[PDB]
Design a protein around this motif. Structure first.
Motif, mmCIF file in Angstrom:
data_model
loop_
_atom_site.group_PDB
_atom_site.id
_atom_site.type_symbol
_atom_site.label_atom_id
_atom_site.label_comp_id
_atom_site.label_asym_id
_atom_site.label_seq_id
_atom_site.Cartn_x
_atom_site.Cartn_y
_atom_site.Cartn_z
ATOM 1 N N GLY A 1 0.871 -1.353 0.003
ATOM 2 C CA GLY A 1 -0.100 -0.126 0.063
ATOM 3 C C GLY A 1 0.815 1.263 0.025
ATOM 4 N N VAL A 2 1.365 1.712 -1.079
ATOM 5 C CA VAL A 2 1.902 2.919 -1.561
ATOM 6 C C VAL A 2 1.043 3.918 -2.007
ATOM 7 N N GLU A 3 1.038 4.979 -1.680
ATOM 8 C CA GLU A 3 0.245 6.204 -1.808
ATOM 9 C C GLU A 3 1.033 7.397 -1.964
ATOM 10 N N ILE A 4 1.187 7.721 -3.283
ATOM 11 C CA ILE A 4 1.995 9.100 -3.586
ATOM 12 C C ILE A 4 0.872 10.383 -3.773
ATOM 13 N N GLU A 5 1.324 11.412 -3.433
ATOM 14 C CA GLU A 5 0.793 12.545 -3.349
ATOM 15 C C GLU A 5 1.869 13.650 -3.754
ATOM 16 N N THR A 6 2.106 14.003 -5.145
ATOM 17 C CA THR A 6 3.199 14.506 -5.470
ATOM 18 C C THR A 6 3.169 16.066 -5.173
ATOM 19 N N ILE A 7 4.435 16.698 -4.856
ATOM 20 C CA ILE A 7 4.461 18.147 -4.979
ATOM 21 C C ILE A 7 5.226 18.307 -6.121
ATOM 22 N N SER A 8 4.742 19.119 -7.043
ATOM 23 C CA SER A 8 4.714 18.962 -8.498
ATOM 24 C C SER A 8 6.624 18.855 -8.884
ATOM 25 N N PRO A 9 7.321 19.716 -8.523
ATOM 26 C CA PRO A 9 8.596 20.137 -9.820
ATOM 27 C C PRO A 9 9.562 19.086 -9.751
ATOM 28 N N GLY A 10 10.340 19.027 -10.729
ATOM 29 C CA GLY A 10 11.149 17.979 -11.093
ATOM 30 C C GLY A 10 11.201 17.796 -12.787
ATOM 31 N N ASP A 11 11.183 16.510 -12.978
ATOM 32 C CA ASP A 11 11.403 16.359 -14.688
ATOM 33 C C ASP A 11 10.275 14.920 -14.699
ATOM 34 N N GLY A 12 10.317 14.244 -13.943
ATOM 35 C CA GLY A 12 9.092 12.905 -14.265
ATOM 36 C C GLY A 12 9.573 12.027 -15.111
ATOM 37 N N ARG A 13 10.827 11.880 -15.381
ATOM 38 C CA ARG A 13 11.366 10.951 -16.573
ATOM 39 C C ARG A 13 12.571 10.347 -16.151
ATOM 40 N N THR A 14 13.428 10.857 -15.223
ATOM 41 C CA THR A 14 14.721 10.404 -14.881
ATOM 42 C C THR A 14 14.283 9.311 -13.587
ATOM 43 N N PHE A 15 14.045 8.264 -14.021
ATOM 44 C CA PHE A 15 13.497 7.204 -12.873
ATOM 45 C C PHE A 15 14.663 6.515 -12.467
ATOM 46 N N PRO A 16 14.694 6.193 -11.112
ATOM 47 C CA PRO A 16 15.768 5.282 -10.694
ATOM 48 C C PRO A 16 15.552 3.938 -10.920
ATOM 49 N N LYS A 17 16.914 3.373 -11.320
ATOM 50 C CA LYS A 17 16.884 1.645 -11.975
ATOM 51 C C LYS A 17 17.413 0.946 -10.832
ATOM 52 N N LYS A 18 17.788 -0.181 -11.423
ATOM 53 C CA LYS A 18 18.512 -1.242 -10.875
ATOM 54 C C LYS A 18 20.035 -0.760 -10.938
ATOM 55 N N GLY A 19 20.788 -1.061 -9.532
ATOM 56 C CA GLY A 19 22.148 -0.962 -9.794
ATOM 57 C C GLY A 19 22.452 0.573 -9.653
ATOM 58 N N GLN A 20 21.638 1.482 -8.958
ATOM 59 C CA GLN A 20 21.927 2.768 -9.045
ATOM 60 C C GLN A 20 21.765 3.292 -7.307
ATOM 61 N N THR A 21 22.589 4.111 -7.124
ATOM 62 C CA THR A 21 22.510 4.812 -5.708
ATOM 63 C C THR A 21 22.142 6.130 -5.467
ATOM 64 N N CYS A 22 20.976 6.348 -5.068
ATOM 65 C CA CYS A 22 20.295 7.716 -4.898
ATOM 66 C C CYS A 22 20.306 8.198 -3.527
ATOM 67 N N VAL A 23 20.092 9.536 -3.561
ATOM 68 C CA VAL A 23 20.217 10.441 -2.309
ATOM 69 C C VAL A 23 19.017 11.214 -2.136
ATOM 70 N N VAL A 24 18.409 10.987 -0.799
ATOM 71 C CA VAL A 24 16.928 11.347 -0.211
ATOM 72 C C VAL A 24 16.925 12.145 0.833
ATOM 73 N N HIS A 25 16.664 13.348 0.877
ATOM 74 C CA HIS A 25 16.436 14.089 2.045
ATOM 75 C C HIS A 25 14.698 13.602 2.698
ATOM 76 N N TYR A 26 15.122 12.689 3.385
ATOM 77 C CA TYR A 26 13.620 12.066 3.945
ATOM 78 C C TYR A 26 13.400 12.866 5.305
ATOM 79 N N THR A 27 12.231 12.853 5.678
ATOM 80 C CA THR A 27 11.483 13.324 6.799
ATOM 81 C C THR A 27 10.451 12.471 7.520
ATOM 82 N N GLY A 28 10.711 12.053 8.653
ATOM 83 C CA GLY A 28 9.672 11.020 9.131
ATOM 84 C C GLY A 28 8.463 11.546 10.053
ATOM 85 N N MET A 29 7.611 11.011 10.214
ATOM 86 C CA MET A 29 6.284 11.657 10.803
ATOM 87 C C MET A 29 5.574 10.196 11.168
#
Length: 107
Positions: A1-29
């Protein structure tokens, strides 16, 4: 159960794939609760890769459903993160997770 409510900006085409290392400014709640985790505080923005079961499953599907520059809003079920056992002293059993996630990666 993954629900996405996107705040818009970015590109929407450079998607993460296998074998890739990605950087996230996460924030828990916690739902109807306070904060419990923030990569914004430690200022080391949590470099991690995809497909090695490092993160939980609910956060893993959310990273693949984003792109560079986006700002999502996760909403995970208890059965994908901790809901049977619960992380000791930090997350109670059968809990619902909220995340503010911004992906600013490389690769």
């Amino acid at each position: 159960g993954v629900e996405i409510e996107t705040i818009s900006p970015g590109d929407g085409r450079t998607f993460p794939k296998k074998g890739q290392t990605c950087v996230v400014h996460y924030t828990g709640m916690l739902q109807n609760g306070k904060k419990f985790d923030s990569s914004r505080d430690r200022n080391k923005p949590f470099k991690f890769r995809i497909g090695k079961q490092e993160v939980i499953k609910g956060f893993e599907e959310g990273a693949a459903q984003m792109s560079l520059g986006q700002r999502a809003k996760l909403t995970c079920t208890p059965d994908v993160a901790y809901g049977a056992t619960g992380h000791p002293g930090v997350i109670p059993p059968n809990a619902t997770l909220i995340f503010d996630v911004e992906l600013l990666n490389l690769e």
